[PDB]
């Protein structure tokens, strides 16, 4: 349980098709979790961050996105927004610790980035913790969108665009959401000493 692949990685998925790695049944160490430079946010919505090093948990999951700067506050358990309601929703009874990265020189090319996408259109809300891989065309009207876009049709995936000199906001924040769900079958450690 190194927590060294969700962090310090050259590959980071988009908001849709977000990565998810199980950290099952190994030796956890949260003392090394802190020193990856001052994070933009290290909000711990469940357990206390100071007590998290030595408390008893169960199987954890470490998500991985890239997220625009002004919409990193939509990762709180009940929020409304494109990131919060259409791509990655969190349950209201959360027990995790969302951590940002504030990356601006590693996930933003000079000419821009178009492999970083997010879904804008959906016909319904999202159940929390749901992967949302999809390609097929949205229909906003009384006309089927069979296989071609067109008025009253949009491709429900928009490129982000990450150019330098965009400010504190509008810059790609890598976001890891370490969920700490308990399934009453403990496998990870419960306090290294």
């Amino acid at each position, epitope marked *: 349980c190194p927590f060294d692949e969700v962090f310090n990685a050259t590959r980071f998925a988009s908001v849709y098709a977000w990565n998810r790695k199980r950290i099952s049944n190994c030796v956890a160490d949260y003392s090394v979790l802190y020193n990856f430079a001052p994070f933009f946010a290290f909000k711990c919505y469940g357990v206390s961050p100071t007590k998290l090093n030595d408390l008893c948990f169960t199987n954890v999951y470490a998500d991985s996105f890239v997220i625009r700067g002004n*919409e990193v506050s939509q990762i709180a358990p009940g929020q*409304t927004g494109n990131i919060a*309601d259409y791509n990655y929703k969190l349950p209201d009874d959360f027990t995790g610790c969302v951590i940002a990265w504030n990356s601006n020189k590693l996930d933003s090319k000079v000419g821009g980035n178009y492999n970083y996408r997010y879904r*804008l259109f959906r*016909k*319904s809300n999202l159940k929390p913790f749901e992967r949302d891989i999809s390609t097929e065309i949205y229909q906003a*009207g009384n006309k089927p969108c069979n296989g071609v876009a067109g008025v009253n049709c949009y491709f429900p995936l928009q*490129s982000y665009g990450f*150019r330098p000199t965009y*400010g504190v906001g509008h810059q790609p924040y890598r976001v890891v959401v370490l969920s700490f769900e308990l399934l009453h079958a403990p496998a990870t450690v419960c306090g290294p000493k």
Partner: antibody
Amino acid sequence: VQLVQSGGGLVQPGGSLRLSCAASGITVSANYMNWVRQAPGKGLEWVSLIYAGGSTFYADSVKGRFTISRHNSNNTLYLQMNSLRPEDTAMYYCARDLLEAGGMDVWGQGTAVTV
Amino acid sequence: ELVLTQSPGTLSLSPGERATLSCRASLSVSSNFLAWYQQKPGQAPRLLVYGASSRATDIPDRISGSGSGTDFTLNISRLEPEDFAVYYCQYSDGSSWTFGQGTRLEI
């Protein structure tokens, strides 16, 4: 494609006026609809917005004293006023403002508040 | 959380002449979320551009949508007597959706 609206009038201050926006060729049950206000002699600003899902948004000046509902049987749009103040005398448009477009705006009614 | 200043507030264009209108955000915002659109006096506003780099339907594509960084400029090549109307630019982030103040256009 084609959206009409009606339901304005003159309302005493603190009374509620029910506002409507019908549609034709556009399903309001899954789209990005929002309202805009033209106070006379002034520019536009937000009123409210409803997502395709059941998530709403409000301007911080007009936060509260508001609601937005979309009927499922008829493809119309509704907002219901509450505890009206006399700086809301304006013209209201229902809109289909996508985030990658501007959509089709509406003729709009004139809501006025006077004693 | 932003203001969208349009300069100048009035512009005295002569018929059949080029027009340049620019609205500048308070921050270095992205281009993929701002749109300019018309407003005729007393009528419904009509879409003009989206994303400040394209056109819209039922438009002769004679309006140039450009703008990089902070100064987002609308360039109008040809103009007609039916096209004298005020112009609003709207920014829509998804968390901040501030609007702009229109510029009156007349001969």
